[PDB]
């Protein structure tokens, strides 16, 4: 606080008295920054200042110039800068002996000095701190307190400021810090501080590493620093070998083998957890880097150019030393644990999982004997290790080689799922879930499908830890059975389904598990509802009455929530009921889309009533309206033209939704509903379309919406033009100019996100124009005379598509939309467009290349356009 106050702390330290004295700080001292450093700069240099008082000064100093938000104290840095006619130059005389005084800790004084120095370095007008620090690293006395506090301050400075600033004297700092990196200093703590400082200085030392002269010595010192007695400098040295690996992989071929290899293998073999964990981290990072390099090499091979970064295959080179020590680590499972601390065995598991992906199919021979032999060990440790390891290697090797192992190990897994231990059952459930999720052909065999289903349905009533896996095991299995349908001749639905006999029992068991009193553990309830949605989605032609029963039950459950929706006492109530209502609405949509047309009629009334009553919600909130809008967006499509009766009550709520631009999530859903979904009303939306068009124009005027709303609005314009058809007059002049003006926007190639965003805007305008032309022309064989109003605009459309064709950063779809837009102009007029096209042959490139495009839409549209054009030019 103050010189008068700090001496009182030395005599009588307290807690309430310090807070009482701190009241005047923010009132006077913070504002009166000048002639306030002087009083704090005359106490803690004195050895008579007790630790308890110096810490109570350092804490308040650090609070005064450090904060969670930087800029509010950058203002303090600016206020401090104006005082540098005394500031930092008077405390030069103070810091030189404030260090390394009294009790053997930095007492947060070094943290205070770091504030001053990180405040100065953005201006760089007073470099003299660097000699003030480096002088006492080679000083004759070299007391451990001074050296350790100085190196700790250097670390603070390196880790606080933006890395770009400190490059002015990087070489000197690097040369100084390595002097304290030597074991020749008798003090052990100085080694700890030196190792800590180097870790944070790697950010900006790039100019030193990029030439061998210093780097060879640096690597020698760092690697020799691992052969050290103290545990803290061992772990810190390995922690400095990692994050050296990630930053400078390219140079490692001279160091990794002779030095890093043996020390890292011995580290993984270490009995103490820390060193083994650091070795696991190192060898995980090296294979992460090799995976990225393999991805880049694949990209270069696809482009045909040689790769710019050749891989050294460190992880792939050495497996016989890695796999056995890795597997043995899994045997040291903690008997009782909270499953939250990063135990070495979990790291070993994730490292082996990464190794499987990086090494691909060479991992199998090294790990197979352990899995085969220890799977039946009476020691539960080895059973857990064998089951846990087997589930990690599922990725990587192709399913052809892994198929026989799964086939001949499935009988063991089912009986392994029941075990006196709990962790064995948990890991068996995890393994079987991943097996059925990743290798569908292995789990689709009927040799053990019935025992597998029986065991799964029996385990669905078990603890949430295994139930959360049995859900998502039923999923990715039901879908695989749906895909592998015995006959799928018609596109409508598979006539028969491998799960047909058990399907109703599966649905009943899922319903019983959904409302368990422990559904919140491991998000069991949400997983169960998602699994139920996936089950209903992939239902067969058969078992429809199970869907009918599910509809009745889910409708009973949907209206049941409406009471607790009102009876709210806490935010968690809102969280839980919002999640429950969203899941209920999604399941109701997914189950309505499946039932027969006739069956939906008897439920539509109650569905719409419940939906409209729920839509009131909290008088408006993005967490509720989206679900209702999607549900209606499905009901209107499934029901068809009968929606006319419900439209009258619903439309004011739609007019609420359209104006919700503060929440773009509701806006896009409402616009989608307004589009082809509401288009099913055909020539009956005419009374309602006026306010809809007004609101859409307003959403086109207000420039606060998300960038993705505009294409949906253009698509809605096109759909409305298609729907109304012959009564777009007094409306076309209002939208044509808007889309004309919008279409000419441009953005550069600095980010390909902007490139494909512009591509979406292009295609959305293109399809809007196609819809407008189709709607104006009508389905009649003769051309309606009202189409003449768009005639003067055609040349701008051709110029716009030519401007699209000028750039070559295309993707799929735009070519098909261009073909569609060109294929109807000939039908519209047939006498003039044949001579606007030929003046600019650029579209012939799109047409001819479309014939060979890689997608059905583009091929069909380009063939149709070419047939339309060629059958009109022949008449000449």
């Amino acid at each position: 606080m103050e010189l008068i106050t700090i001496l009182e702390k030395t005599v009588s330290p307290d807690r309430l008295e310090l807070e009482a004295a701190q009241k005047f700080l923010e009132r006077a001292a913070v504002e009166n920054l000048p002639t306030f450093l002087v009083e704090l700069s005359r106490v803690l240099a004195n050895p008579g200042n007790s630790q308890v008082a110096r810490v109570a000064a350092g804490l308040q100093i650090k609070n005064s110039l450090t904060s969670k938000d930087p800029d509010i104290k950058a203002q303090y840095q600016q206020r401090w800068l104006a005082i540098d006619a005394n500031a930092r130059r008077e405390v030069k005389n103070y810091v030189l002996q404030t260090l390394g005084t009294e009790t053997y800790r930095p007492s947060s004084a070094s943290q205070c000095v770091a504030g001053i120095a990180c405040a100065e370095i953005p201006v760089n007008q007073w470099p003299e701190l660097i000699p003030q620090l480096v002088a006492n690293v080679t000083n004759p006395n070299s007391t451990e307190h001074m050296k350790e506090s100085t190196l700790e301050a250097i670390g603070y400075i390196c880790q606080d400021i933006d890395p770009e600033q400190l490059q002015d004297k990087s070489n000197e700092i690097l040369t100084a810090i390595i002097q304290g990196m030597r074991k020749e200093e008798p003090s052990n703590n100085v080694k700890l501080a030196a190792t800590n400082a180097l870790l944070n200085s790697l950010e900006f030392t790039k100019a030193n590493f990029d030439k061998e002269s210093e780097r060879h010595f640096i690597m020698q010192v760092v690697c020799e620093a691992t052969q050290c007695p103290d545990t803290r400098v061992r772990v810190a040295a390995l922690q400095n070998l990692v994050k050296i690996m990630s930053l400078y992989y390219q140079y490692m071929e001279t160091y990794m083998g002779p030095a890093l290899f043996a020390i890292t293998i011995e580290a993984m073999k270490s009995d103490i957890d820390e060193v083994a964990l650091q070795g696991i981290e190192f060898w995980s990072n090296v294979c992460d880097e090799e995976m990225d390099l393999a991805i880049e090499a694949s990209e270069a091979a696809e482009q045909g150019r040689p790769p710019e970064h050749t891989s050294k295959f460190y992880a792939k080179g050495a497996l016989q030393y890695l796999v056995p020590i890795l597997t043995q680590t899994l045997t040291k499972q903690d008997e009782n644990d909270d499953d939250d601390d990063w135990n070495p065995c979990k790291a070993a598991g994730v490292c082996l999982m990464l190794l499987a992906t990086c090494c691909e199919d060479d991992i199998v021979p090294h790990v197979l004997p352990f899995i085969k032999e220890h799977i039946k060990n009476p020691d539960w440790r080895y059973r857990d290790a064998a089951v846990m390891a087997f589930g990690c290697i599922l990725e990587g090797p192709e399913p052809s080689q892994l198929k026989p192992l799964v086939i001949q190990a499935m009988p063991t897994l089912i009986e392994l799922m029941k075990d006196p231990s709990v962790v064995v059952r948990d890991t068996a459930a995890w393994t079987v879930g991943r097996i059925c999720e990743l290798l569908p052909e292995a789990a689709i065999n009927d040799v053990y499908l019935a025992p597998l289903l029986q065991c799964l349905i029996e385990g669905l009533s078990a603890e949430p830890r295994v139930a959360s896996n049995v859900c998502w095991a039923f999923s990715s299995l039901a879908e695989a059975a749906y895909e592998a349908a015995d006959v799928a001749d018609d596109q409508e639905e598979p006539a028969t389904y491998c799960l047909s006999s058990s399907f109703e029992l599966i649905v009943q068991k899922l319903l019983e598990t959904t409302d368990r009193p422990d559904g919140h553990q491991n998000n069991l309830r949400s997983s169960a509802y998602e699994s139920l949605m996936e089950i209903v989605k992939n239902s067969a032609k058969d078992c429809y009455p199970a869907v009918q029963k599910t509809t009745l039950v889910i409708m009973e459950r949907l209206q049941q929530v409406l009471q607790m929706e009102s009876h709210i006492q806490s935010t968690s109530d809102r969280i839980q009921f919002n999640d429950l209502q969203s899941l209920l609405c999604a399941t109701l949509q997914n189950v309505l889309r499946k039932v027969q047309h006739q069956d939906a009629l008897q439920i539509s009334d109650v569905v719409m009533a419940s939906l409209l009553r729920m839509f009131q919600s909290t008088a408006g909130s993005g967490g509720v309206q989206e679900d209702a809008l999607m549900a209606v967006s499905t009901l209107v499509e499934v029901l068809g033209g009968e929606f006319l009766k419900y439209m009258e009550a619903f439309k004011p709520f739609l007019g609420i939704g359209l104006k919700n631009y503060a929440e773009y999530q509701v806006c896009l859903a409402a616009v989608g509903l307004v589009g082809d979904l509401c288009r099913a009303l055909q020539s009956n939306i005419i009374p309602f379309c006026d306010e809809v068009m007004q609101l859409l124009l307003e959403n086109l005027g207000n420039e606060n919406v998300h960038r993705s709303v505009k294409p949906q609005i253009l698509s809605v314009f096109g759909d409305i033009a298609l729907a109304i058809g012959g009564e777009f007059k007094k409306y076309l002049e209002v939208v044509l100019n808007t889309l004309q003006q919008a279409s000419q926007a441009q953005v550069d190639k600095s980010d390909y996100d902007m490139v494909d965003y512009l591509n979406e805007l292009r295609e959305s305008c293109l399809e809007a124009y196609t819809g407008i032309v189709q709607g104006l022309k009508g389905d009649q064989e003769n051309v309606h005379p009202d189409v003449m109003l768009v005639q003067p605009r055609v040349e701008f459309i051709l110029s716009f598509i030519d401007h699209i064709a000028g750039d070559e950063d295309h993707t799929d779809g735009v070519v098909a939309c261009a073909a569609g837009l060109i294929g109807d102009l000939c039908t519209a007029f047939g006498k003039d467009v044949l001579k606007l096209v030929e003046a600019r042959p650029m579209i012939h490139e799109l047409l001819t290349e479309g014939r060979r495009s890689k997608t059905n839409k583009a091929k069909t549209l380009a063939t149709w356009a070419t047939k339309e054009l060629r059958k009109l030019k022949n008449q000449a």
Partner: protein, 45 residues
């Protein structure tokens, strides 16, 4: 074939590995809209 995402090591353990269902619904609805629009456009040929 690689794919997936390089999540931090903390959350990579015993993961369910399922994307959020809410974002999937929007993509599914967009695909449905595109398919319906194409099917309606096919009626004129």
């Amino acid at each position: 074939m690689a794919e997936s995402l390089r999540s931090p090591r903390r959350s990579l353990y015993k993961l369910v590995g399922s994307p959020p269902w809410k974002e999937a619904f929007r993509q599914r609805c967009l695909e449905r809209m595109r398919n319906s629009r194409d099917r309606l456009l096919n009626r004129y040929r």
